[PDB]
Design a binder for these strands. Structure first.
Ligand code: RLT
Ligand code: RLT
Ligand code: MN
Ligand code: MN
Ligand code: MN
Ligand code: MN
Ligand code: MN
Ligand code: MN
Ligand code: NH4
Ligand code: NH4
Ligand code: ZN
Ligand code: ZN
Lengths: 163, 365, 365, 163
DNA sequence: TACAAAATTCCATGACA
DNA sequence: ATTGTCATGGAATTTTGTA
DNA sequence: TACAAAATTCCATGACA
DNA sequence: ATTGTCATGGAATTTTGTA
């Protein structure tokens, strides 16, 4: 077939609820299918509404052909369904309770959860201001395959913040 | 005085013989082609030139033309020009008749995130309680980020940029010397992240020119999207951002987005040309394109331009000249010449100032 | 549609043979050097071009470059340009890339008092309760009268000019369309005296340029006289008036006063050259000089200029553009061409307007 | 000697008091010795003070080498005396009661007085607004010698308001 | 080894407080 | 101690489809 | 049928809200 | 139905005092 590329598919999910920081409670996690590049968006609820506001931000930069997600209320709603049709994004759903997504993504998706709990504890209340640092760390971290940071795969150059 | 000898027929340096030099009313007169003029004793002549000049603070020719009426001596102008150099008034008020040298066309940053250029637009009509836009442009790709703010403030600039640097961290940020970016709070925010701050010379937007030129394109497209409608720009910003980042520069044959990512996203009319290459093949093809980009050269010098020499008498233009007050500062000296277009000067008086020639005139005389 | 024939190997105007034209997914595709592109049916193509354009309201090359990605048909640009002509938005917002023609250098008035040029300077710092200066310049001689006023008003203009015309009455007064001179009260004052009023085109100070250029020289000399001191200009005006009226134009080798009177008054450095001529001899020598005066010619056209042709699609610049709103009015037509630099147009919509090219752009396409 | 010229000599005198117009009472009359060109300045008193203010106006246009006048208090004062020295004007005085001035000037000076009384009566209160019209008429009026208007002699061209 | 006309490239002009 | 930029649309130059 | 250097003329640059 | 102007100071060109 045609070899895989950035923006081909975006995997999204909600982490939460978390201890309140700046009155936020949830993190919407967007990983790019091919590169493993990650975006993190703090939200006040795992709602279609907050999803749209968040994804509006991301889609000012780039628009994926496909979004994959679990059948959570937020993504199954008809409003989200319409939002995506407007922007010409095809929506893709895992079947209930059997969350199929990429080998590479599962791992990255695991790392986030560990890395969140890790630096969450000790300052469980101030994780909002840390999200930039986290995102930066994740995206500039060498994958065992490729020996490339997601950053490198997306931009084809080196970041000025290595790990 | 020394004019004594001359009436007696003896020669003097200058004072050409063939004209008869006579005496009338205890003054030394001379018959000349132009007519019969008076010759003042050396010691009176500065006093004369000054009186003439001080009538309307006139230049070389205008001054001489008054004096010509009544007097003659050798090398009249040499003396006039000696005065024009010492008239503190004329020097700080008259404008220049010398254009500055040809502009410079600094090289494209090599990599994306090598250098960000920032600026604030505004104030605008209020939408949703916001008044200004923070525009961030990547020097290499031309890729642009937009952020609505309520004030062009350090605090809001930091808020915005924290979001942006979530994606990546730049080596250098270039800005104008606007209050928001010069503040100590910002300077530290930037040092905290190992980002070098760099500022353009005072009152020279052309230096922040890469952002400024994006401002044009922003305001233009917003204008176009708002014909008819009430000016509700807040919700438009995203669209503009996208639209502009995916617009081909006719010279490069590439959208900024392309130069940043090497592939088009799920945009309208997304170019497919590289659909067959692995990411890797594609990624290095991109790395090639970036280096082979069109780059302008500096233009020919205008026929009456000047360049700054070390130790030159040079004057800085006034900040915000008051009504009826001089458009230039007193003379100051060129300390170092950073480039043929940027100078360090010992000013008023005296601190080292880094300045653009466009804000300078060479002291004349 | 008409594309049917082509898949079957038969020729069509445009659509060059040698490329294989095939079918995929019910679309008519074509293999080309650039790659394999889709060919839309005639009826879809306007809809396509518009969609592409409306992304960022891009020009010819920028628009085509998007379309090139996905599609091909014959004479692509011809279609694109057809759209750029119909985008009401782009036409009224984009700036011109065509400079206006070379300026004109109208002839010197023949006699003093043939034509006065007037203008108001201000507001200034308050001296003695006055805020503005009325500057009157004789077109022929350049001789200048100054009058302090409290407001740039019809009433005060009349007061001032009544004094001036005590000396002589001019044939014509040229002014900008400032409220003070356009008023009906003034118009009558002027008709009462058999003086023709004449106005420069809207928002073109260059037309009142003979006065404007005297304003420069006024403000400059006042500035110079006020360095150090508090801005007390009221009592200085007379001095300035005199000083400036007795200043040699280096090009003419004559002070305005000289051109007005043919002799220097009891001024500093008063020229004596004609001391031997009767008034009469002198008076006709003056009458000679006036005609033999240096007169400039128009400059070469800039390489990309335009001239106004009768019945041309032409647009007027907005008065005081609001924030984020179009810098140009809708298209309008050239009615008559008064000179290669002044035009009458049927505007919005529609009144005859007399306008300077400098406030016009040719509608492109 | 050297033939006579404009600005060579200015003859000045006060006419007044007159019926009040716009709160003015006197007219300062300045005739140019050679051309016969006339200036008229309304004043509130025949005082050095008002003379100076008036002549400041005229001397923004041109400065005479000489001013001639009667020995009226206004011109004999030391303030006027200083005013003139400042501007480099030599002052000239007729002897008391024997007012010697030019043949041409006496006549012009007579015309003014007639022309004032003439159009003064009938509107004795509104002669201020008329001063421009008067000045204009006087200066554009053919002298029997020269067949030239003072206007013509000063400017060496024709006015656009003949009489 | 050549044409007319399309397709491309050139580049002055203007505007970003 | 730092430094102009580049969309735009006619003109001008090059490439193209056919001999 | 001539020189160096003064004296003149040329003219781009900038600014008049 | 109206329209650019011109001081300024280096450069460039012409004239000048002497052979
Ligand atoms: C120190 C210090 N204090 N004040 C300044 C200063 O520069 N002030 C002005 C009002 C001139 C300014 N202008 C722009 C701008 O973009 N102007 C328009 C433009 C853009 C490009 C081009 F080539 C010409 C003009 C800004 O963004 C800006 O922030 N400022 C402050 O610096
Ligand atoms: C109708 C009508 N409504 N408004 C106008 C109008 O012209 N308004 C402006 C603000 C531009 C203006 N400007 C100047 C002036 O001298 N400007 C500076 C300048 C001088 C010479 C040069 F070449 C360029 C600029 C005035 O004197 C003046 O009265 N006005 C009104 O006309
Ligand atoms: Mn979930
Ligand atoms: Mn700024
Ligand atoms: Mn700016
Ligand atoms: Mn005006
Ligand atoms: Mn003006
Ligand atoms: Mn008397
Ligand atoms: N550079
Ligand atoms: N003309
Ligand atoms: Zn001076
Ligand atoms: Zn458009």
């Amino acid at each position: 077939d045609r070899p895989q590329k950035p923006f081909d598919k975006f995997f999204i999910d909600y982490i939460g609820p978390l201890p309140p920081s700046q009155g936020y409670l949830y993190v919407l996690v967007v990983v790019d299918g091919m590169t493993g590049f990650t975006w993190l968006y703090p939200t006040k609820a795992p709602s279609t509404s907050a999803t749209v506001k968040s994804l509006n931000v991301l889609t000012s930069i780039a628009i994926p052909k496909v979004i994959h997600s679990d059948q959570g209320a937020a993504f199954t709603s008809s409003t989200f369904a319409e939002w995506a049709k407007e922007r010409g994004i095809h929506l893709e759903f895992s079947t209930p309770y059997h969350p199929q997504s990429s080998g590479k993504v599962e791992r990255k998706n695991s790392d986030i959860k560990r890395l969140l709990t890790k630096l969450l504890v000790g300052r469980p209340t101030k994780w909002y201001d840390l999200l930039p640092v986290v995102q930066l760390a994740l995206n500039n971290t060498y994958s065992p395959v490729l020996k490339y940071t997601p950053h490198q795969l997306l931009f084809g150059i080196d970041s000025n913040t290595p790990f | 005085a020394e004019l004594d000898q001359l009436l007696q027929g003896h020669y003097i340096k200058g004072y050409p013989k063939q004209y008869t030099y006579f005496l009338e009313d205890g003054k030394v007169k001379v018959s000349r082609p132009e007519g019969v003029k008076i010759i003042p004793p050396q010691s009176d002549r500065q006093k004369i030139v000054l009186q003439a000049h001080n009538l309307a603070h006139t230049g070389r020719e205008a001054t001489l033309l008054k004096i010509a009426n009544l007097y003659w001596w050798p090398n009249m102008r040499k003396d006039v020009v000696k005065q024009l150099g010492r008239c503190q008034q004329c020097l700080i008020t008259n404008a220049s008749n010398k254009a500055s040298g040809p502009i410079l066309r600094p090289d494209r940053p090599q990599k994306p995130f090598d250098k960000f250029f920032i600026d604030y637009i505004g104030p605008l009509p209020p939408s949703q309680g916001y008044l200004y836009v923070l525009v961030v442009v990547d020097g290499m790709t031309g890729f642009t980020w937009l952020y609505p703010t309520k004030a062009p403030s350090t605090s809001a600039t930091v808020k915005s940029l924290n979001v942006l640097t979530s994606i990546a961290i730049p080596k250098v940020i270039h800005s104008d010397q606007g209050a928001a970016f010069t503040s100590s709070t910002f300077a530290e925010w930037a040092k905290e992240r190992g980002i070098h701050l760099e500022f353009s010379t005072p009152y020279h937007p052309q230096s922040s020119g890469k952002v400024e030129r994006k401002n044009s394109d922003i305001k233009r497209l917003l204008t176009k999207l708002l014909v008819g409608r009430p000016t509700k720009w807040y919700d438009l910003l995203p669209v503009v951002q996208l639209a502009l980042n995916n617009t081909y520069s006719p010279v490069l044959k590439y959208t900024p987005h392309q130069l940043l990512f090497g592939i088009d996203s799920n945009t309208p009319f997304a170019n497919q040309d590289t659909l067959d290459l692995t990411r890797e093949e594609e990624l290095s093809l991109l790395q090639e394109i970036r280096t082979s980009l069109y780059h302008p050269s500096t233009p020919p010098a205008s026929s009456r331009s000047w360049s700054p020499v070390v130790g030159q008498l040079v004057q800085e233009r006034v900040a915000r000249p008051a009504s009826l007050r001089p458009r230039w500062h007193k003379p100051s000296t060129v300390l170092k010449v950073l480039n043929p277009r940027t100078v360090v000067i010992l000013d008023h008086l005296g601190n080292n100032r880094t300045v653009s020639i466009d804000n300078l005139k060479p002291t004349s005389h």
